[PDB]
Amino acid sequence: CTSILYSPKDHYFGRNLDYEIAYGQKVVITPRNYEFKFANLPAEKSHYAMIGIAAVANNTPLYCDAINEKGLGVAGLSFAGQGKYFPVVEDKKNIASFEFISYILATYETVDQVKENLTDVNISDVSFSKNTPASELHWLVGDKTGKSIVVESDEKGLHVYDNPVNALTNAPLFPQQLTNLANYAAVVPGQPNNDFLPGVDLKMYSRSLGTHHLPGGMDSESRFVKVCFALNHAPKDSDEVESVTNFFHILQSVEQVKGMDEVGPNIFEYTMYTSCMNLEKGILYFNCYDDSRISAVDMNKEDLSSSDLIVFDLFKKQDISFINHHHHH
Amino acid sequence: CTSILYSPKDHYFGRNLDYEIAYGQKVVITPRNYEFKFANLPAEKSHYAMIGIAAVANNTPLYCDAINEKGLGVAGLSFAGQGKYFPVVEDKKNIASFEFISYILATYETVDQVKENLTDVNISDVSFSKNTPASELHWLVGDKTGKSIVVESDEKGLHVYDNPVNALTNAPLFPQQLTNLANYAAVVPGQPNNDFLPGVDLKMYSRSLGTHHLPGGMDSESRFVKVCFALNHAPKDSDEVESVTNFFHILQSVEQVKGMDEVGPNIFEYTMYTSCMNLEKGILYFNCYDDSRISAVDMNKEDLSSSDLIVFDLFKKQDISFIN
Amino acid sequence: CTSILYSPKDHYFGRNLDYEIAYGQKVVITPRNYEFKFANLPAEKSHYAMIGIAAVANNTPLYCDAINEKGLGVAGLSFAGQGKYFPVVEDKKNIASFEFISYILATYETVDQVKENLTDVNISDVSFSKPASELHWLVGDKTGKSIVVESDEKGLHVYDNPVNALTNAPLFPQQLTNLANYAAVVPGQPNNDFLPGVDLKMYSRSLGTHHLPGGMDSESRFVKVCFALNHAPKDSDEVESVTNFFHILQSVEQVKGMDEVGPNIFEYTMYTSCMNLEKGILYFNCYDDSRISAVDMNKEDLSSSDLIVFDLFKKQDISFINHH
Amino acid sequence: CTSILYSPKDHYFGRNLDYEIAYGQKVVITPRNYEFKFANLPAEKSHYAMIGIAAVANNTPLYCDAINEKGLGVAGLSFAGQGKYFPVVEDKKNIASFEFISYILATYETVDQVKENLTDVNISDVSFSPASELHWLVGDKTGKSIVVESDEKGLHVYDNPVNALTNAPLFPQQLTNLANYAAVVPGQPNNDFLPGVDLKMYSRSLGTHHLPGGMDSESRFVKVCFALNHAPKDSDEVESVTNFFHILQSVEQVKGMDEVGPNIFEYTMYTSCMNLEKGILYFNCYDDSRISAVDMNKEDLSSSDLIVFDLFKKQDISFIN
Ligand SMILES: [Mg+2]
Ligand SMILES: [Mg+2]
């Protein structure tokens, strides 16, 4: 998975979800008066409205990534082999991993608040379904200040990191992702000046030889480095549709195509969907592996004082526009 | 630019066109009785119909890439700094660079036929319009056999290469592109076996560490290596919509996003459009940088006995489906 | 800097010291009855004899790397920007950073002993003059195992070292994670699972090492030396072992001009030490002298009380074959 | 193999010989009146003297690399899978591959002269006893070099802008691959990678993080071009020789890293450094790190007998006690 915060003028938050199997994800709006029943926290019957991608089980949204009506966004990203959750304790605020997005977006408005208010939180090992383990995750949190934090629960506890590059993928731990980034400090989008072999005329046979060592792999570090680069150099001061178009192209630059990421014999991890959520406007734009067309759901076109989940299809078939048809005249 | 021939069941031929500025490209069907007038070749008043992406000037299609009604495909890809064209010569068949796609598609049906009949060819330095240079190009040619050839005119003349990887980008010369692939021979889509430090347990902390050195650059070699990999490992035995979807994802893997390939201060080469042509069906599928939705034009729903160019818009605005 | 523990038969411990400034290093033997005076530890007037590379100031050996008569070795390596030292505190055993090699080698015999007894240790911010240099350490012994000792912002950590090598930054767990990025490297030719069904042009020997790092930076040197060490010969006698040891560190040597640390200022491999743990023999050479020199600790009076000092840096010692 | 021409003040020409088996190589001085019996050229009983590394069989120097008394240098480097030799023909000057170094150094003085005189040359398929596939680096005291390659398309002579050579691929392809490393710098790059982001510049020389360290031919070529280009200038004799050995050591092959068969490894067997001005050969080998030196001009160059010294030596340890 790859998640980004993109700040051309408005602010846009979303992710690729890359995996080998779908889990019934949908587009889900949770209105202000849907009652959240948290495993070890008091129920919230009145809260901020939110919109994101979620599975729905027993009338409960299991969010993958979402934003709330105040312009805060949270995305959960696979963290297998690095994450650790901990038993419920009487002296911490226990948030189960599957409810982290819901609780944060129900309650909080800004990244600054989330950072100061995780000091007494424990990410618990509670799962939604009995006899089933919770998925191992870490989180990107971003807001309309254009800044983000990374939240990781690992064997040394809960950590919150300022995110200087507004992107996140999977393993390794976040400080280690930032160290690896500097290994690419010599990369440039155009042609480097020749300080490699001064006095020699190199055969500059292709454009953008400065990106010859930019990573294109499907692994977590390759996708992190490349999406950081694509995000940093993306256009700015763009209006809504141009911004959304640019956002999808950033995440497409680290798309996982079927065949290239083998996780088992003839089993492939691929980009199942891509979400793009406008923090200012409460609009979720999306497409998926089978449908290249971008779709949009505006949370603010619904009744946010209601109490039931509002659900739309996420996964769609290829929506081809047939320019040509039989000539009747 | 990046071009491929994809053979999951039907055969699909097409390309990314990556540049900084558009050249009036549109979807153009040339029907059987449009009269081709060539600089140094007999006129062809009757020929195979074709569909592809072209600029139109003076009622003449200037094709970027196209397929014909018999399932032959030709794509012209930028080859600046490597291509060389030559003055017309009496002892050769002279094809001007800008007419190469039109001529080959009007006249031949198979890759084999093209190879056989290029033996006496000179790619001439003639340009379409007076006082404008011919663009430097090389070409990928593919058909329904699932095989392709690369055609390159350079300082040593004309060369035709069998293409074992069914892909093409820009510089360097094609044998050099092929040698560079061997530099990636240890890449795998999954996890490698640890013969790097035998006896040590490595922390295989991410999926697909076998692709950690797969190139992701915007330069011509990086795109060639990566697209060869994406094409080789793509699904097979797909139906029409699934095959088209997978085709676009293959070329999406080497898409050039604005900002990443700088060809001048604040001037960027990016993926302007993506074409995907079904060789069996004569259907052209396309999208562009500004419109993610795939559009389709079926050549066989037009009147192929006509004599005039049939033209459709290529570049479109983002076509968002508003759900609620 | 690059330090290794090499275990072909006997056990060899040593390092390249890569820097832009020399600081008066010599070969120094400290006999058993030289009195160590530490800043916050009891004085040691009787202890283990050691041999290594040190600067001598105020009749006091400031070791860079050394081994003791029992076959324990400690090498200090630059850790700038990562190390953190702490004020002396009453609840801990405080070892100053510049005393670490002297104290550990004076007092302990094995890596296991060093590990057990670091549990209450604080690396103090005490200098030798009036600032200490930021360091971390490799500790190895004749079991063929080694540990890494790092004091950082989270305090003191001791890591088992599965690869028996150490360079500079980043923190040791990050160095291990980065190794997995090279899991597909092999010394020979990889099998082609990159483009199955395509015959690649395997044009050079050892294409499996095409992505092996050759940079002068800390991570590149770490990855490469781990590879060279892991694949080096075994079952060798003394001279063959020493020769192979020097070649391993040679594989990651820094040549003047490639590591620019300031305007026309370069970090380069100033010396290379190789110490036989079983035999107490230090072998060395330096940037200006390719010939290997040898000092045997056990050819000295180790019950003595004074430092025994030999020249480290030497001019090129050329054997002139013909004359007149 | 890796060969370089290094021009700090005097000019130094030499190579690493990387292989898995030795072939009786020794240091050989061939004096002016040794009679060269060329395969398909007239014999030469009076010619330039030369010094370098060679096998000797049937009183014949089979040179690997050498320089002559006039400051010309030629190194043969493995080129397996790329080189092609051709049958002896009546209308070309045929030079067998195993005698190319001998003939060039016996006959010519400068790189320009060699270029002019290769126009009608055929590198023939004649073998001394098949012939090993080679290509050649030729350099002189001008500080310039050329690459001589006989392949499928015939004999080619290339100007060498980087004064280095390894093995495959063909030389223009080596130069193309060089440009892939255009972004490498010896120190820290300016931050045009992620402008406005403070990177963790955690190591010195992060500019070289993508510099190749492989044992393969392209890795060694790129690295040695960089090491050679950035080496010190204006050095005196011993300082230059020291720097020269370090340049080649930056691409040396340690036993175990280059597997060419089951427990069979290609490694750096010897390293030669020949001063073009002074006619001195310096050498060491895998088993002896001490540099040895043979001076051609301390011998009788009006002689006719080969003058031979041992090349491979035991590790020459200086015992300080
Ligand atoms: Mg408690
Ligand atoms: Mg003839």
Author numbering:
A (entry chain C): 2 to 330
B (entry chain A): 2 to 325
C (entry chain E): 2 to 131, 134 to 327
D (entry chain D): 2 to 130, 134 to 325
Q: What do the authors say?
A:
To examine the molecular foundations of BSH substrate specificity, we determined the crystal structures of six of the Lactobacillaceae BSHs examined above: four glycine-preferring (LgasBSHb, LaciBSHa, LingBSH, LreuBSH) and two taurine-preferring (LgasBSHa, LjohBSHc) BSHs. We examined the sequences of these loops and found that taurine-preferring enzymes exclusively contained G-V/T-G (‘G-X-G’) motifs, while glycine-preferring enzymes solely contained S-R-G/S (‘S-R-X’) motifs. To confirm the importance of the selectivity loop, we first created two variant enzymes that swap the central residues in each selectivity loop: a V211R mutant of the taurine-preferring LgasBSHa and a R208V mutant of the glycine-preferring LgasBSHb. We found that both single-swap mutations significantly decreased the specific activities with preferred substrates without significantly impacting the non-preferred substrate. Second, we noted that R208 in LgasBSHb forms a salt bridge with E21, an anionic residue conserved in all glycine-preferring enzymes examined; in taurine-preferring BSHs, this glutamate is always replaced by glycine. We examined the activity of LgasBSHa G23E and LgasBSHb E21G variants and found that they decreased activity with the preferred substrate without impacting non-preferred substrate activity. Third, combining these mutations by adding a G23E V211R salt bridge in LgasBSHa further lowered the preferred activity, while removing the salt bridge in LgasBSHb E21G R208V did not further decrease the preferred activity. Fourth, we created triple mutants of the selectivity loop sequence. Both the LgasBSHa-SRS and LgasBSHb-GVG variants exhibited the greatest reduction in specific activities toward their preferred substrates, with little effect on non-preferred substrate processing. Importantly, without altering secondary structure, the triple mutations significantly decreased substrate selectivity from 76-fold to 14-fold for LgasBSHa and from 353-fold to 2-fold for LgasBSHb.
